[PDB]
Amino acid sequence: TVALVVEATTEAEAKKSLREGGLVPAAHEIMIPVGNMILAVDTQVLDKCALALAASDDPGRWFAENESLIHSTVFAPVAKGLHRVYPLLSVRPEVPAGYEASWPTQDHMPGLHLVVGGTGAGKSSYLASQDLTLVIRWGEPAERFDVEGATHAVSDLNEALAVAFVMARAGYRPAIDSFRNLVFGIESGGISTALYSAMTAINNVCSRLGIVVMVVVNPMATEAKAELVYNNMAASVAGMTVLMDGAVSKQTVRTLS
Amino acid sequence: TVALVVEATTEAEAKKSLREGGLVPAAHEIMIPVGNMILAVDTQVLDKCALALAASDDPGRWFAENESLIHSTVFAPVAKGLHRVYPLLSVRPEVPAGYEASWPTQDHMPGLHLVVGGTGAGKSSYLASQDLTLVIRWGEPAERFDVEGATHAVSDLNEALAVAFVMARAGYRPAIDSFRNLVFGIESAGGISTALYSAMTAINNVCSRLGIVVMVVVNPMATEAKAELVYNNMAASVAGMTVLMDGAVSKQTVRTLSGRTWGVGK
Amino acid sequence: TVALVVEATTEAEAKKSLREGGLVPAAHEIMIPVGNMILAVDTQVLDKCALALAASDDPGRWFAENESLIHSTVFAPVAKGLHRVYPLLSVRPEVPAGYEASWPTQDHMPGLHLVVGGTGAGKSSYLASQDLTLVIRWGEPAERFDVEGATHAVSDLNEALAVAFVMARAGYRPAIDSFRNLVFGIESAGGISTALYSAMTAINNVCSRLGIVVMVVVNPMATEAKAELVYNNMAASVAGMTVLMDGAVSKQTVRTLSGRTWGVGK
Amino acid sequence: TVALVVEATTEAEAKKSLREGGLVPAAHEIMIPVGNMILAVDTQVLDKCALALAASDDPGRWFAENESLIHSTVFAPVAKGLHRVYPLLSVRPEVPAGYEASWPTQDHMPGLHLVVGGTGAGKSSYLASQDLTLVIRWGEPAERFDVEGATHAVSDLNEALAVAFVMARAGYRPAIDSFRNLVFGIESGGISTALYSAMTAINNVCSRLGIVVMVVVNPMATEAKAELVYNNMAASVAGMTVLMDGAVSKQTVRTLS
Amino acid sequence: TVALVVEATTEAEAKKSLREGGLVPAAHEIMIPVGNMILAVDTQVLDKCALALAASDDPGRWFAENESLIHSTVFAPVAKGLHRVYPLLSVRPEVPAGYEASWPTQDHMPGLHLVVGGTGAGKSSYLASQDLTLVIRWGEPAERFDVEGATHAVSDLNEALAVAFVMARAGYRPAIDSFRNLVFGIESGGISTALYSAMTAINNVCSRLGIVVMVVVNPMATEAKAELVYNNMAASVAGMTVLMDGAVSKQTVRTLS
Amino acid sequence: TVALVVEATTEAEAKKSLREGGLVPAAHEIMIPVGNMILAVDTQVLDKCALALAASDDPGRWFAENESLIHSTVFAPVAKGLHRVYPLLSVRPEVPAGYEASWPTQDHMPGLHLVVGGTGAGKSSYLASQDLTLVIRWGEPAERFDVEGATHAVSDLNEALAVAFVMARAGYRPAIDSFRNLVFGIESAGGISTALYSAMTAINNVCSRLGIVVMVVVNPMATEAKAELVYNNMAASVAGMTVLMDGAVSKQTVRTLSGRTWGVGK
């Protein structure tokens, strides 16, 4: 029931929600700027899904039976004027009252936890150690892990964020493998600055939802500029783990202290 | 209420306020050019909010429950032709009569005071030493300080400017942490877009016309070689600028009501 | 038939399939993002063509006399909102149940197999050793091999993917020579646009969902200095890749149904 | 009464003036190309303002009371085909009959007199020595000079050009401080060539009007490419004074001889 | 009778030929992608002109009298969706049955034969040695050769290709001097890669038509990257001849054998 | 009269002349491609003006009081499909029958004669020695010569070319001082845009078709390193070119009816 083509042309219609093709977010809609795109998470749909999934005796069966409903948690509004009305849009830094965390580390701030670098088999071996519920697979070549793993395959950034948000909000532990297409598709030392603010935007969405989502990221930096890029990433998110040669090279985490 | 999609299509319509979809600012509307965007502050709504906030119990409480007044204080006019009708738009350098200032420095000119460079801890250390009413939080990853500190989180430049304007016109002390998105988001043709400097002069002179000072954290992320030439360009754009090197003041320039002040540290 | 100029203008039309001008893929439609283009494969038409092709006398004769069915197997949807509605679109990694493979290698994951590097004679030599049904020829200057060899000449990326898909689904062995126009046509932000790597990951996962392998000749034309980097980024994008050193296999990497195999020769 | 949004859609409407939304200048309209913008000076409005100001007993009060009318001297035509119809538009080089000048120097050609380089106090020290009527302040941060100086603060290029044109036609001596925002806004050794042709355009508008307007300009050139950028500017305008360390380093002026 | 401004707006109109403003090439239309342009050769008009010229008793008279018909062999379709409908368009490599060639070399594949580098007198002296029927002059300043030579002067790429295609189909021997305006006009080591794909596309039109067209081309590479640029060109066409100091430096040709 | 805003919207309107808003030049219209602009010369209006001017008392007077005939001689067609319909448009190399020339040199091919480089005094001294009827002044700061000398000042490229065309056709000697705005205004992909080279060839061949020579001051502003290469690319674009070094001829090259001439100085 998301408007796909018809957008507000009167003041009366412009006041409706983003879902209906208006330009004013409802209380339960959070806009997420990614590059020059603007997505929206419907926190009512998100919470309906998280609650159904957290309260289920068979969470796997409800998941499979409502994939379409889960994916609809995030969508791209149709109204073209959003960039103008919300200039230099980000997501505000909020933490829900009573938030608590023990994973990925103790008192980990809600937000993103980037897993960067790694052998490739050092990635997958680090993901296996984190006791994840599933791995959301996006933008990566099909390998064995997609065939007989605890995975969920998606096609676009709406589906990736929607599943991670729903799983984490239901109390489970998701990871996204990976933001490869987000590193390639956003363009503006050596890395597009828009990648950093995209990560802060998605990070602060998780912050507002009181969740952590682990995400694999390969910034494709020359190994000279790699320390400066990794530092600009740590400055954008709640936590970051660098893997070099399959071992944890360094981890830096904002904590609630 | 602010027009969002219907803009002037006739000459009679074109002559209305920016709020109404026209192309002619009312006397109480000031345009704010930022890059290829044009915002507007409504000084009537600004005055109404400043009076209400100056008398309320809690400043952080009033803001979170008056979102609809804040969204009306600074907005992005809908009309397209603004860029053409006002070529190379800036904001005029104007100080109100009888303006006074003791913060951030004595006789500090109205405008922006940029806090640039340093570390995240030295940035927190510096603003904590400034007796701010609260820090407006924009464009930065949520951290411990967002839970335990006196903050107000916002999502776009309209909200950041509006909250700072209202707090200052009500006699409070705002800082904005930070203009990260304005550094990343504006892009033109060293190493740093020249439109960043014109955007800061514009926002500076709006603060000037409003007779206020807004402190703003800015990390321009210039090369260590080009850092000093970028810091000179930014200092020439604003009322005041403080450069931090490891929590301490490394350089300062301030325009005052009687002249200029400089500072040298390290 | 495929809509060419009339696209969804109402919400009810937007629910229709891509073929019909809508914005929502039917169950039997898979979107293929290539750079800033979005193609679509109709798996129902694909399954029909593969059954017809498997029962025909000549595979080259069938394709030349069924251009209308091929142009329906892969097309470019007309609706313009596709980029907005599916942000950063990829193709998802799937493997059909009971997929098996003994070519190009044993237990080769479905997807693309890139043949990169080498000379024109070394490339032509290697394809001759692969026991291909025919070579799909696209974007290259006509040569003697187009007269004397088992070939099918095509004009655009739709026809090239359609022919390869129908053949592989019919049990034949296609190779595409080459992706020259895709290398030249996709441009973005080293030395090589990163939209090349995501385009092949997208085409690789379409083959993956179809349970097929398509051999593809690629010459990314990186400076010999950065040539090792680019080959490693391409290997990371696909199921398999072979590098030819002057006619013979210099390197080879393949994702398999069990693990990952590396060949190093030269 | 300047057309703001409605432009010519028929051949009959296209032949009307720029003020009316047409594509053909009236005899009293001069087009001014600046970058990819096209402005227009209405010489009838200009001369009406110059006369009232020059004839007034209290020139200060008349301009205090007629700011809006003065600023309407220069405007941006709404008609969009002007770029096509007048390809590579400039302003023609004319000198009115009987032109005569003793400032900035003797026999100074009408046009711009650029004041380039110098320091912040070196600039203001030079402008004070030129016996100006007022300084038009544009695109610069507010300072003490804007509090208690003989200044007029403006917001855009229409207003800056309008006041200078009217002031100088009335027999007064204006300066613009500065073209900062024009140096920044025009993009195309090391400086945008469009900046050079913009100042030639504005220069030739002044020559057609028989006036000299003094203009502060900082081109932001690296000092390797400095003398060369400065030579390129002198080649675009009537006169140029270079300041360094507050002193007049160099000065070149086209004279009527 | 080519649609110049009115393009298909319905599905029924879209199915018509490129000439009629449709999006679907007829059997006798071949699309030619050049940079971001799409041209089309009408092979029925092509063979009408070629036969009339090959059969005429006074071929010069027939072409003097039918210039406008010859030039209509190639045109630019009006329909705008062609870029979307035919993604990454090329021209398919075909060779007609029974194709034979003895010039420019024995068994020369059909396609373009490029003449690169050299000097002005080196180029001219080479084309004289090839026994050409005429030289098609395009994008070059008028010289003595355009007054007293066996030349046909043209203005755009449609006309240049149209005359070359007709002349060669009729059994004559044309050359195009030159593709200068194509090297300049197509923008994307040192040379725009779109120059290469454009040459391959035009090359393959010739191969489908079973002809060879000789074309002068100056890619204007820096002398270091020149021998790389020449190799990328030879990898795009059937034959290439490098002139340096008026002598044939290098020559590589694909043969039918 | 020239259509300024209404362009062909039907196939019947599309076949009218460029003057009328169509897409097909009349027999007496010649399109002139300059950068991404397309101009047109009307040789019928050109012929009428050239007769009127040839019989008038004063050339400078006739031009100033016939601006309407001039703007009608060269104009920018309104129809937008022109770039598509005429791909990579140039002007064709043609010489009218019986053309002859003693200026600027004997048997000089019709086209442009570029006067390049030097100083402002060397250019002024060189043009003064050329017996020009008048100098067409375009895109230059007004100077003493605009008061004391024989000039016609113009504003855009249309009227600069029109005045030159009318004068040369009526047997007078025009020079354009200068193509500065053309060097600054056309931007493409060394150091100097290749589109500058194609624009001069286009304008050169219009003059060639009109059987006239027009002298044009051009300062391409090349680095002293790349000036050799830039000057050779310009010489290869036009009929004649004269390079001035400090007032004297340093290099010259001219295509003539019988062949070519070179000059070497310094």
Looking at the DSSP bridge assignments, the partners of residue E255 are E108
User: Given the DSSP bridges, would you call strands A239-244 and A247-253 parallel, antiparallel or unpaired?
Assistant: antiparallel
CB of A149 within 8 Å of a chain C CB? The answer is no
CB spacing of C142 vs E207 below 8 angstroms:
yes
Can you tell me the distance from the alpha carbon of B170 to that of B55, in angstroms, rounded to the nearest whole number? Answer: 9
Q: Which residues in F lie closer than 8 A to residue E139 (C-beta atoms)?
A: 88, 90, 198, 201
Task: Please name the helix (run of DSSP H) or strand (run of DSSP E) that holds residue A198, with its range, or none.
Answer: helix A193-208
On the 0-12 / 13-18 / 19+ scale of CB atoms within 10 A, D78 is buried
**Determination technique for this entry:** X-ray
Q: Looking at chain C, which residue has its C-alpha nearest residue E197?
A: C181
**DSSP character string of D135-203:** EEE-SS---THHHHSSEEE-SSHHHHHHHHHHHHHTT--EEEE--HHHHHH-----S-HHHHHHHHHHH
Can you tell me the distance from the alpha carbon of C192 to that of C223, in angstroms, rounded to the nearest whole number? Answer: 10
From residue D224, alpha-carbon distances to A2, A7, C150, D230 in Å are 58, 54, 63, 11
The count of C-alpha atoms lying within 13 angstroms of the C-alpha of F13, restricted to the half-sphere facing its C-beta, is: 13
From residue A31, alpha-carbon distances to A38, A56, A208, B155, C56 in Å are 7, 29, 12, 9, 54
Breaks in chain A (C to N > 2.5 A) come right after 188
Q: Which value in Å is the resolution of this experimental model?
A: 2.5
CB of C133 within 8 Å of a chain A CB? The answer is no
Contact between B246 and B118 under an 8 Å Cβ cutoff? The reply is: yes
Task: Determine F/E contact with 3+ CB pairs under 8 A as the test.
Answer: yes
Contact between C13 and C22 under an 8 Å Cβ cutoff? The reply is: yes
Can you tell me the distance from the alpha carbon of A136 to that of A178, in angstroms, rounded to the nearest whole number? Answer: 8
Looking at the DSSP bridge assignments, the partners of residue E212 are E111
Q: What are phi and psi of B77, to 5 degrees?
A: -50, 145
User: Is residue E71 classed as helix, strand or coil in its secondary structure?
Assistant: helix
From residue F163, alpha-carbon distances to A72, D170, F42, F68, F173 in Å are 66, 35, 13, 12, 11
Q: Choose among C113, C172, C120, C170: nearest CA to C145.
A: C120
Can you tell me the distance from the alpha carbon of B8 to that of D5, in angstroms, rounded to the nearest whole number? Answer: 8
For residue F110, is the peptide bond before it cis, meaning its omega torsion is within 30 degrees of 0? no
Can you tell me the distance from the alpha carbon of B256 to that of C42, in angstroms, rounded to the nearest whole number? Answer: 70
CB of F94 within 8 Å of a chain E CB? The answer is yes
Q: Choose among C251, C53, C263, C237: nearest CA to C162.
A: C53
CB spacing of B155 vs A87 below 8 angstroms:
no
User: Given the DSSP bridges, would you call strands C260-264 and C248-255 parallel, antiparallel or unpaired?
Assistant: antiparallel
Q: Which residues in C lie closer than 8 A to residue E84 (C-beta atoms)?
A: 37, 76, 78
Contact between F105 and F254 under an 8 Å Cβ cutoff? The reply is: yes
Lookup: tokens for A98? 């009573």
User: Given the DSSP bridges, would you call strands C151-153 and C111-116 parallel, antiparallel or unpaired?
Assistant: unpaired
**DSSP character string of F45-91:** HHHHHHHHHHHSS-HHHHHHT-HHHHHTTEE----TTHHHHSTT---
Looking at the DSSP bridge assignments, the partners of residue F74 are F41
Can you tell me the distance from the alpha carbon of D151 to that of D136, in angstroms, rounded to the nearest whole number? Answer: 6
For residue E152, give the DSSP letter. E
Answer left, alpha or beta for residue C243, where phi above 0 means left and psi between -120 and 50 means alpha: beta
Looking at the DSSP bridge assignments, the partners of residue D212 are D111
Contact between A85 and A205 under an 8 Å Cβ cutoff? The reply is: no
CB of B76 within 8 Å of a chain A CB? The answer is yes
For residue B104, is the peptide bond before it cis, meaning its omega torsion is within 30 degrees of 0? yes
For residue B178, is the peptide bond before it cis, meaning its omega torsion is within 30 degrees of 0? yes
Can you tell me the distance from the alpha carbon of D223 to that of D23, in angstroms, rounded to the nearest whole number? Answer: 43
Can you tell me the distance from the alpha carbon of B239 to that of B201, in angstroms, rounded to the nearest whole number? Answer: 9
User: Is residue E83 classed as helix, strand or coil in its secondary structure?
Assistant: helix
Lookup: tokens for E25? 């090439």
On the 0-12 / 13-18 / 19+ scale of CB atoms within 10 A, A10 is exposed
Q: What are phi and psi of D182, to 5 degrees?
A: -80, -40
Q: Which residues in B lie closer than 8 A to residue D76 (C-beta atoms)?
A: 84-87
Looking at the DSSP bridge assignments, the partners of residue C218 are C116
Breaks in chain F (C to N > 2.5 A) come right after 189
Structural domain for E40, as ranges: 1-257
Lookup: tokens for F266? 């310094």
Q: What are phi and psi of C228, to 5 degrees?
A: -55, -35
Contact between E38 and E84 under an 8 Å Cβ cutoff? The reply is: no
Q: E23 to chain C nearest CA, in Å?
A: 8
Can you tell me the distance from the alpha carbon of F152 to that of F164, in angstroms, rounded to the nearest whole number? Answer: 10
| Number of domain units in chain C | 1
Residue pointed to by tokens 């002619």: B24
Can you tell me the distance from the alpha carbon of A153 to that of B195, in angstroms, rounded to the nearest whole number? Answer: 42
Can you tell me the distance from the alpha carbon of D173 to that of D212, in angstroms, rounded to the nearest whole number? Answer: 8
User: Is residue E87 classed as helix, strand or coil in its secondary structure?
Assistant: coil
Q: Choose among D175, D62, D47, D36: nearest CA to D113.
A: D175
- Angle of helix C194-210 versus helix C157-169 axis, rounded to 10: 30
Contact between C19 and C13 under an 8 Å Cβ cutoff? The reply is: no
The neighbours of chain A, by the rule of 3 or more Cβ pairs under 8 Å, are B, C
On the 0-12 / 13-18 / 19+ scale of CB atoms within 10 A, F103 is middle
Lookup: tokens for C109? 């994951």
Q: In the 3-class helix/strand/coil scheme, how is F166-226 assigned residue by residue?
A: HHHHCCCCEEEECCHHHHHHCCCCCCCCHHHHHHHHHHHHHHHHHCCEEEEEECCCCCCCC
Interface of D with B in 200-239 (CB under 8 A): 220, 222
Lookup: tokens for E217? 């081309």
CA D190 to chain CA mean position, Å: 23
Interface of A with B in 164-193 (CB under 8 A): 188-189, 193
For residue F245, give the DSSP letter. E
Q: Looking at chain C, which residue has its C-alpha nearest residue E225?
A: C223
First CA to last CA across chain D, in angstroms?
Answer: 42
CB spacing of D93 vs F141 below 8 angstroms:
yes
* All residues at 6 or more sequence positions from E100 whose CB lies less than 8 Å from its CB, including other chains: none
CB of F109 within 8 Å of a chain D CB? The answer is no
- Over its C-alpha atoms, chain B yields an Rg (Å, rounded) of 18
CB of F194 within 8 Å of a chain E CB? The answer is yes
User: Given the DSSP bridges, would you call strands B248-255 and F29-34 parallel, antiparallel or unpaired?
Assistant: unpaired
* All residues at 6 or more sequence positions from A128 whose CB lies less than 8 Å from its CB, including other chains: none
Can you tell me the distance from the alpha carbon of C182 to that of C178, in angstroms, rounded to the nearest whole number? Answer: 9
Looking at the DSSP bridge assignments, the partners of residue E251 are E241
Contact between E190 and E225 under an 8 Å Cβ cutoff? The reply is: yes
From residue E118, alpha-carbon distances to D59, D231, E131 in Å are 72, 39, 19
Residue pointed to by tokens 């320091």: D119
Can you tell me the distance from the alpha carbon of E75 to that of E4, in angstroms, rounded to the nearest whole number? Answer: 10
Can you tell me the distance from the alpha carbon of C23 to that of C26, in angstroms, rounded to the nearest whole number? Answer: 10
Lookup: tokens for D124? 């203001």
CB of E154 within 8 Å of a chain F CB? The answer is yes
CB of C102 within 8 Å of a chain A CB? The answer is no
Longest dimension (CA), chain B: 60
Q: Looking at chain F, which residue has its C-alpha nearest residue E32?
A: F87
Q: E18 to chain F nearest CA, in Å?
A: 13
Looking at the DSSP bridge assignments, the partners of residue D242 are D116, D250
Can you tell me the distance from the alpha carbon of D195 to that of D183, in angstroms, rounded to the nearest whole number? Answer: 7
CB of F74 within 8 Å of a chain D CB? The answer is no
Mutation for C interface: E41, E92, E215, most C CBs within 10 A: E92
CB spacing of C185 vs E197 below 8 angstroms:
yes
Can you tell me the distance from the alpha carbon of C131 to that of A101, in angstroms, rounded to the nearest whole number? Answer: 58
Q: In chain D, which ranges are E strands? A: 29-34, 37-42, 74-75, 111-117, 134-137, 151-153, 174-177, 212-217, 239-244, 247-253
Closest CB from A142, A157, A220 relative to C87: A157
From residue F262, alpha-carbon distances to F114, F200, F252 in Å are 14, 20, 5
Q: Which residues in A lie closer than 8 A to residue C8 (C-beta atoms)?
A: 4-5
* All residues at 6 or more sequence positions from F96 whose CB lies less than 8 Å from its CB, including other chains: F110, F209, F210, F211
From residue E73, alpha-carbon distances to D235, E30, E45 in Å are 51, 11, 6
Q: Which residues in D lie closer than 8 A to residue F39 (C-beta atoms)?
A: 87
Breaks in chain D (C to N > 2.5 A) come right after 188
Residue pointed to by tokens 């890619």: E219
Residue pointed to by tokens 């142009």: C71
Q: Annotated binding site: which residue ranges of A? A: 124
